[PDB]
């Protein structure tokens, strides 16, 4: 009997390029998979959905790359943690995993032009907005002094 396996990161990152490894051990022929990540306690809205066939040329292994969006106001509630449900339908056989999501969209590095400032002077500071892969993105930041 074939075993259908999914491998995803332990936490997931909102608005970031996440990857899942989709395998079918001891399978035969093309196995068409559809992955769908929904919210966990509701399961009434699809956060993302992708489709990928599994060919025996790669010995039934593919990888599915999505970007799970940070919409639908599930981040506004700060109580406890947030989870998503990943259902991967390998043909007609579904597998299911509940993965934690982290409110994180990259890194911000603040560089000031000095280290000690005279009163009355001007602080010049750059903010470098990089993603999880350390590449430039365009986001909206809140700056407090």
């Amino acid at each position: 009997s074939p075993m259908y396996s999914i491998i995803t990161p332990n936490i997931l990152r909102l608005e970031s390029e996440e990857t899942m490894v989709l395998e079918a051990h001891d399978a035969q022929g093309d196995v068409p998979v559809t992955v769908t990540v929904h919210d966990f306690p509701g399961k009434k809205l699809v956060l993302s959905s992708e489709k990928t066939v599994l060919t025996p040329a790669t010995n039934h292994m593919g990888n599915v790359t999505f970007t799970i969006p940070a919409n639908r106001e599930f981040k506004s509630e700060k109580g406890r943690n947030k989870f998503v449900t990943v259902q991967a339908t390998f043909g007609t056989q579904v597998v299911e995993k509940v993965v934690l999501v982290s409110l994180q969209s990259g890194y911000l590095f603040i560089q000031t032009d000095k280290t000690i400032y005279t009163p009355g002077s001007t602080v010049l500071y750059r903010i470098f907005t990089v993603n999880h892969k350390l590449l430039p993105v365009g986001r909206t930041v809140m700056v407090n002094i």
């Binding site: 966990f40 399961k43 509940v98």
Partner: protein, 338 residues
Amino acid sequence: QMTEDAVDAERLKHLIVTPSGCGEQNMIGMTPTVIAVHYLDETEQWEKFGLEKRQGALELIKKGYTQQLAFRQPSSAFAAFVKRAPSTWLTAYVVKVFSLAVNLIAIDSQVLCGAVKWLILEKQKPDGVFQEDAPVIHQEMIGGLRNNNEKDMALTAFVLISLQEAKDICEEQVNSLPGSITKAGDFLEANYMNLQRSYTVAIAGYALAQMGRLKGPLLNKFLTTAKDKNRWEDPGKQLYNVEATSYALLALLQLKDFDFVPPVVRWLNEQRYYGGGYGSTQATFMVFQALAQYQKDAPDHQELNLDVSLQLPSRSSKITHRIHWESASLLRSEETKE
């Protein structure tokens, strides 16, 4: 004032019950599992319970949903058998489970609206009275309706509740539903003073508290039958009184009253009822609907906002500041050189 204790997630592990049997015993197998997943995903207490077990109930209640349509009669009715005469109570309670179950998985809606049209067309008199012919084999799930002095009041209030939460799905499908709602409400507003059992006052207060009118004498008699201002207690079994206090807390949450809610809350918390057992189906469904609605309405979407505007003679504008419960702008500092 948001904070209160809830039912702990390790306490309620014994209500994962596999449904099996006839048209009533599988309903016994449904009801604490369905109300367990509903209370647990309203409380968001999966983290200290086990997330993958959430998937297990998601097929286990489907283990009843593949069964109960086999026990659906072809006249859009529900009975204990296919040759059994249908019940008003069993069809109303099937609709009461199934309209509570569509918030997680909905499959078919014509069974619910067809059963609602069955209780409107066959069991609703023009007086506004639902009547029970009683073909129910087991009296365990009937609860406080069983062995009650005013059976017609509590029965018609229960069927008005059972019609009323399925109104928002079968509004377009059933058009005669608000007429039967108005007839049942006009029956319920007549003999509210003639009740002497606080179970009937509690279930009629919930059936008249839902999206309509209740008068000063009606609300005053609903308030004054609360013994020690926290419980609706009658001679009989304790589960009937627990179901009465749960209907009373649902009534007090529906009327947006937050003063009489917390003594009923501490009385339900000190009762330590975790569900399960013999003859406990009504009690187990309404306790977790009561604190599931409390965990919906316990912040009550308060969201405290001060729209504080400071006007200066130094500048030509008044600057407003909207302090919300959102922590993006909690405190702000304004600097004035004059």
